Amino acid sequence: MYLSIIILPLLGSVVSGFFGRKVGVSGAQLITCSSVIITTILSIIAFFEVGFNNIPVTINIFRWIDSEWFIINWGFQYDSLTVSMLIPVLIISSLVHIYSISYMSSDPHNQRFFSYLSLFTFMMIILVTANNYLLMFVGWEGVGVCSYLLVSFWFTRIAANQSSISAFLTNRVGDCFLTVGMFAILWSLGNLDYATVFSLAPYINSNVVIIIGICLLIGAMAKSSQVGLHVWLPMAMEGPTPVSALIHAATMVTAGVYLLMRSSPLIEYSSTVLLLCLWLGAITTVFSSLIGLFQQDIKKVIAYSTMSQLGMMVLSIGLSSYNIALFHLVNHAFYKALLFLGAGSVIHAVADNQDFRKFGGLISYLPLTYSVMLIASLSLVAFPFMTGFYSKDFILESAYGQFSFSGVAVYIIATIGAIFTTLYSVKVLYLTFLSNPNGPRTYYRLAIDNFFSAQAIKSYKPAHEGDFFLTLPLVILALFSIFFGFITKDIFIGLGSNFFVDNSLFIHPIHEIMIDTEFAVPVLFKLLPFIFTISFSVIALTLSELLSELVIYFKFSRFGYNIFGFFNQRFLIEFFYNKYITNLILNLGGQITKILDKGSIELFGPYGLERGLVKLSKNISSLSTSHVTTYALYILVGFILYLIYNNLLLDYSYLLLIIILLLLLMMIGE
Amino acid sequence: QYDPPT
Amino acid sequence: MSLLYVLLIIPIIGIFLISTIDSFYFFNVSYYKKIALITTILNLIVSLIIYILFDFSNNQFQFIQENLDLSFYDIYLGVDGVSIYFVLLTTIIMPIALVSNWNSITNNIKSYLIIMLLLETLLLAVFLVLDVLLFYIFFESILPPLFILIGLFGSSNKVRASFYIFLYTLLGSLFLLLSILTMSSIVGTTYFDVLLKSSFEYTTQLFLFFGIFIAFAVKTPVWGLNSWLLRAHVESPLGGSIVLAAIVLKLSLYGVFRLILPILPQASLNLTYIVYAIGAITVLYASFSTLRTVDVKELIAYSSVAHAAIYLMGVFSNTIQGLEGAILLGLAHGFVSSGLFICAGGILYDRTGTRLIYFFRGLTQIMPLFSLFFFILCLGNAGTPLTLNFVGEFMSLYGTLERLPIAGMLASTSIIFSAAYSIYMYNRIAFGGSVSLYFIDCFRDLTKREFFILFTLVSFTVILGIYPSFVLDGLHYNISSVVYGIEPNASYLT
Amino acid sequence: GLQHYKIAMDPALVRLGSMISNRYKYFRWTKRTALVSFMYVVVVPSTIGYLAYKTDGLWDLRAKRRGDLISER
Amino acid sequence: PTPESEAFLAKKPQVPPTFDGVDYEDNKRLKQAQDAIIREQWVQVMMGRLVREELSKCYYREGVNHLEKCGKLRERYLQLLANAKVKGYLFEQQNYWSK
Amino acid sequence: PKIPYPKHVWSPAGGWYAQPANWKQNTAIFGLVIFGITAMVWKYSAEHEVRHKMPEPDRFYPSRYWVKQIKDYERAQKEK
């Protein structure tokens, strides 16, 4: 069974993509969705078997690379971590598969589409089910190619093309550091099977832990978009929304998070990497939450929410608390999926518009869609007693529980990021739903008012909600975003939970903060985010639809104008990327291939030797005037010089220099 | 509708 | 009679068969391609019989033949672990090279078929001869058939290209020849078994290293010596380009396993920092320029310069992982480079008459099958996993890094920079718009010929990417012999 | 030798290919251009080579445990 | 222990793996010495491949208490990791150390 | 509406709005293949699933009915 949940998603995709001609659009959907659904059902069984009963299972099909000490197998290991990883991956992938049945009945190429999402599902199981780092890299690069293939799904979009390049190229930038890190693992241990790296890790050199740990830290940044390796994610949203839900909200961008958790037995023996895991997590936590506030696209705003929750995931990794990271991980996935899926039905309601400047009302038009997005946002903002409450809030107490300077320092950074989390959370809810209409008439012109004489049959299209296939995933995630947090709180968080007892997530007693997270923290700090959440929201409710003047006054001030533009344009980071990184590469290539290759390399080489040797030989041909007296004088001169060379006992260097001098005055014309 | 494959 | 000499003669029957039919049957030009195609399939069969008999754990050269008729320059043939996959690659590629020009060659079809069949005999003899003078006799003999092939079936500037391939090879080889001749005057022979067990003075090794390295740096080619490749790999006919990038490029890599590693141990160990400087500079410069290349064939050609540096750094890593991955990289490079030239030089240039990337955009709308394969081939060029190209790059890079960390790291930028030009080429041709508006006539997709030479080429790179034990297994024991060094607790056991 | 499909050959594109093809014939030696040739052919590879030489044999991770050094020289 | 299978008769070295007290001009002997020195380095490396297989078995079987139940197999792997490396027969063939 | 597109372009994934009249029996034909090799995988998986801790008989355990590593153990434990 355990090897079956690897094969099925692969099998649907090849029939969908290579025989999609012979199964048709609806057949491609039925095959792949069922394959995902079947894989979903067995995944939850493995969670009940691998984790609850504490039996990890090993599959070793055959060898992949076999060179001396290096025996990498196509082998698969299920343990407590990978069954937990496979729950959000498989629940959401199925729902997104159903969500796309409604989503893309108008898109022509609909069965190339359904194969990519089932090919994405296959490689995410490969990533998490591996025995070793190298096989993980197959699911690693495999989701990266699946993402490129989906970002540029509308490949006649030039925008999708540049976005696909950015996603593909940026993830390679991290994959270099990941690959170099695995070279350090192979060098210092002789293999990279997980059982072998972690058993030996408590004895290896400290400095090899940092060098290995650092390399996988950069690799985590590219997949899990961080403060530097993120430019690929916000414009990865050029793909269809089903893609962004499964891949760019909940699954692919936590690959780096999963790597940090999986490697916890290894990285736990060097506080340095955990220190950067902490500070980088808060810096990216606040860097992202600020950006989304000033975004005039619902897809691009909710994209930036993904990075912010991702940022808090890395923070807990640096907290040496991976159980919280996994708990928050899965919990963030469920509601965040709904947030994009809720937005997706919104985009279908309007004529595929994405700007907030022409969104409003829609309360009566999209009642169900509003209800779910509120449910998701409340768990996103960590409203108390929700799915996201236990997962998102516990972090801050865990951050504050570690009574160190860094822990308290990022508590402020996380909290101010949480403050801005509220701001865009209501901004999406307000502008789209709780505000005056800002689009054209057709978005809201119902049939209750006649307003038409001969066009009563058509022209209404007043932004109705979707059908069953579009709404069913919304309802399913809605239940999880309410209750799933409380049900599994002891499963992952607990206080002395023995769920992770097969050394799946290793934690060292020297930096335990679990007891301090619940006891030593003052009560005010425990409920402080709740105070800020309920408070800072009403100011936004006060600043819009109640006053709607202070925000305009702040905009047009010279100090306020630039702060809007600076944060809108993503801290000018891509500006500093395109001009001074990639345009630099494109000009070094220009210098090399013009000045050097088709340049000096040829001139100080074939073309130069060609040009001068032709001239040198025309000159020596010039002496061949075919007149007998000139020829006799040439013979007598050579007769003289051979006598000079011999009986004078000249050093041979003069003769060489005389010849070079003659050859190179023969080179000189006239 | 769905066009016959060709 | 040795199976190895069977390999060298079947193409000679094909040449003789092709040239006399006109005396037997205005015979149709279709028949001579039928003979040439069948003749290469027979070589493939024999080479496959040899592999099914080959023993993966024997030091002695296998499938040798008694001579007992010693002259001054006899021809000895042998097959061990390192040379067999190179022979296996040659007999796999050559049928595909002829099929790739089944329609593109119009005039002098006899001449084209005879050169390639001759070209096959000469190329196999390189990996089969059992002394270094024989190695040089066959590594330079390919020059006249390649010279005439380019200038008889080449592109517009074929005259310049033919003169570049002949005069760079000849010059580098003459520096190699001065080294081979010095060895023979010291050892008194060149036979591999006799010559390998001879040692050399340190100074001799340094001066022997140069000349050989001058020669192999021209034929690698390393950056700054690579202008012959951009001309002679573009202006060549497609079959000649396939042979020049899948087979001829790999003679120098194999020449390190016979001429540098076992007989110049000290010299290599001390000169690696030069080689890795050249190799890393080669990767780094050959990637930036191919990012800016407009000729679609020249971009594919000049990415080979980028990859040939990686397996050149792997053979100087003194690591069993680097040396093996280097052979795997040069084996996988033969499949992916062959396919990419077929895609660019054979599928685009045939339809459009041009190779300027300016004229190509969004072919995925019109060529679904071509876009498919041209995407796996682009992933293999980028060393994406599931591809033997990835395993060769990964194993070479570990060996390069383990030998010199800074050089392997500067080589490790290839993961970033090879995907940069391989996908930038893919999105400009397959994607990036609806179709190029310079097409005033719609294009047919892959024919069955095109669909099958690409299907083979990506099949080999993928199957050996899931299971590279097919090549790695027979490489292990013999490539152990080309390492240099000892461990304090495992040397001089008594 | 065979005929291909019909193409809207753009003289500007056609002539741009001619110059890229034939640019090698017009290269000259200048104060700028020798500096570019000198940096990328001489200085840069000399920099890598100097670093490769200066850090050769210096490190080895193979089985260095806790309490031992990566460095070997 | 396990009896030696027939395949482990032809490829078994007939001579101890050294170049000491041997004649390089005797081609049959030089090759066997090279072969035998290669055979030992490879066996030594493959001991590492079994101790890791044994170690990995414990690592799953113990989990939390893996650092104190199969650490005895762990030391064996580290000792082999530090020594067992295929280094070839060429440095042996060309240099004599003679204690 | 429906985007116009060429009718000559053969696709392996189908084309623009591809669906054959026989999209059902062909779907059934392919669906048997997926099932056929899935249990084929399940057989090999059930034969190579290796474990080290045995489950309690009381606890819910779906794999007790197909896997080998514990079915033999369970009947071996049924001997006293």
Short mmCIF file of C-alpha atoms in Angstrom, two decimals, chain A residues 13-29 108-116 153, chain B residues 3 5-6, chain C residues 364 368-369 372 445, chain F residues 9-20:
data_model
loop_
_atom_site.label_atom_id
_atom_site.label_comp_id
_atom_site.label_asym_id
_atom_site.label_seq_id
_atom_site.Cartn_x
_atom_site.Cartn_y
_atom_site.Cartn_z
CA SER A 13 -0.88 12.20 -15.15
CA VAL A 14 0.58 10.18 -18.04
CA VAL A 15 -2.87 9.08 -19.20
CA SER A 16 -4.08 12.65 -18.75
CA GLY A 17 -1.11 14.11 -20.60
CA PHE A 18 0.07 11.48 -23.07
CA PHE A 19 -3.29 9.80 -23.77
CA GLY A 20 -5.49 12.80 -23.00
CA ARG A 21 -6.40 12.59 -26.66
CA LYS A 22 -7.83 9.13 -25.93
CA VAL A 23 -9.68 9.84 -22.67
CA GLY A 24 -11.02 13.29 -23.44
CA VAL A 25 -11.48 16.26 -21.15
CA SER A 26 -13.95 14.63 -18.78
CA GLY A 27 -12.05 11.35 -18.78
CA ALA A 28 -8.80 13.13 -17.97
CA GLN A 29 -10.56 14.79 -15.04
CA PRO A 108 -9.34 24.71 -24.14
CA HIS A 109 -6.22 22.80 -23.04
CA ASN A 110 -7.90 21.34 -19.98
CA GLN A 111 -6.34 17.87 -20.00
CA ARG A 112 -2.76 19.05 -20.25
CA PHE A 113 -3.73 21.09 -17.19
CA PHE A 114 -5.08 18.21 -15.10
CA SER A 115 -1.92 16.19 -15.76
CA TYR A 116 0.40 18.89 -14.41
CA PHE A 153 0.47 27.49 -18.66
CA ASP B 3 -14.96 19.38 -29.89
CA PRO B 5 -10.35 15.42 -31.23
CA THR B 6 -8.54 15.95 -34.51
CA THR C 364 4.14 25.07 -29.11
CA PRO C 368 3.10 19.87 -29.88
CA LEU C 369 5.38 16.84 -30.30
CA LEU C 372 7.52 18.02 -25.86
CA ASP C 445 5.01 19.04 -36.78
CA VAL F 9 -2.32 19.94 -35.21
CA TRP F 10 -2.11 16.46 -33.68
CA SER F 11 -1.58 16.62 -29.92
CA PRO F 12 -0.83 13.75 -27.53
CA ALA F 13 -2.76 15.55 -24.82
CA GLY F 14 -5.68 16.06 -27.17
CA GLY F 15 -5.64 19.46 -28.78
CA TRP F 16 -7.90 22.41 -28.12
CA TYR F 17 -11.30 21.19 -26.96
CA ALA F 18 -10.65 17.50 -27.38
CA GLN F 19 -13.13 14.85 -26.40
CA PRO F 20 -13.79 11.66 -28.42
#
